[PDB]
Amino acid sequence: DLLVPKLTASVTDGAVGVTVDAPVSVTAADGVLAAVTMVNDNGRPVAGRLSPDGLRWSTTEQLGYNRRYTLNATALGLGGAATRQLTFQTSSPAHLTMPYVMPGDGEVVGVGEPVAIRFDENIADRGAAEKAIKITTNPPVEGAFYWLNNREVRWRPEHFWKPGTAVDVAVNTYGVDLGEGMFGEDNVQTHFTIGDEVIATADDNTKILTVRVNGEVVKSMPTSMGKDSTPTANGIYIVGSRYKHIIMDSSTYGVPVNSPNGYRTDVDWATQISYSGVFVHSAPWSVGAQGHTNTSHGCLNVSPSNAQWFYDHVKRGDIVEVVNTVGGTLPGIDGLGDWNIPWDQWRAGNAK
Ligand SMILES: *C(=O)CC(=O)[C@@H](C)CC(=O)C(=O)O
């Protein structure tokens, strides 16, 4: 004997806290869908599509926070007709946080470049945030998340990227509970590629900044680094932004200008390598000391032509390594200091 059609939805009638990170769907068995409509509270229909075989209907546009939706579906079969009405209520956030991802879409960056997702609000459930961030790499390589502060999480492999790696970042935070009633305001997505290996090494024993490109020495720059009382920290630096010129203002990095180690200086050809305020930059006033003596507040002073060369040939995500200074080691949570955190510590993370 014949059977009556059955209607199954990806939600149920009376549901609350329905999350809007996924489409809503309806499926017919023992029959086909003859009509499916979904309206919000205000009678506005929601866009949807019925599969060609008539069995599956799904929403096709974003579903909104704080809504009551009503589904009406009818299924017909040889055995008769069935109709259902489902009303459900979606998540009601207390807060919304918007994520901002670096590096930029379509960019080509150095082998030291981490994926960065910065939220504009403190994240209570770091684990939920991590889970919602989908990273694809090609060639595939293991990586892991680490939080630099309450708002910004970083993802990187254990070692520098292999040049030519495609990296894809899907921050799928819309509809996701990030804790304490905070939900993602929107999704973001970036895709970037790893370019040549560029590693510049500043050795305090020689006072030379050597630039190597895929293992080959292409540039050797006499440099003057931080004087003993304001040394350049040892360790690994990720290259950040670059400037044809910039006013370096110590107060930006915590030191009052009118302090003994304060300064406010206009400089050319400046490449930032730490949030703490270390740059490679043109320093014509210390060209005599470069290659011989440290005289700066911590920056890598090099000649005008070498600073410009550095500006022209080094890109975001390239690496500067400092060795043998009287300084300590650059903090791992500096912002550009990710690689100074040991991998076991990085991999274990701090989602807590
Ligand atoms: C960088 O943060 C500050 C520096 O170390 C350079 C600007 C050089 C410098 O301060 C100097 O007086 O030579």
Numbering used by the authors: 56 to 407
Sentences from the paper on this structure:
The final step of PG biosynthesis in Mtb is catalyzed by two different classes of enzymes, namely the D,D-transpeptidases (also known as Penicillin Binding Proteins – PBPs) and L,D-transpeptidases (Ldts). Conversely, Ldts catalyze the crosslinking of disaccharyl-tetrapeptide polymers by forming a transpeptide bond between the third amino acid in adjacent stem peptides thereby generating 3 → 3 crosslinkages between mDAP residues. Approximately two-thirds of the linkages in Mtb PG are of 3 → 3 type and their synthesis is catalyzed by the Ldts, highlighting the importance of these non-classical transpeptidases to this pathogen. Mtb lacking LdtMt2 is severely attenuated for growth, virulence, has deformed cell walls and exhibits an increased susceptibility to β-lactams.
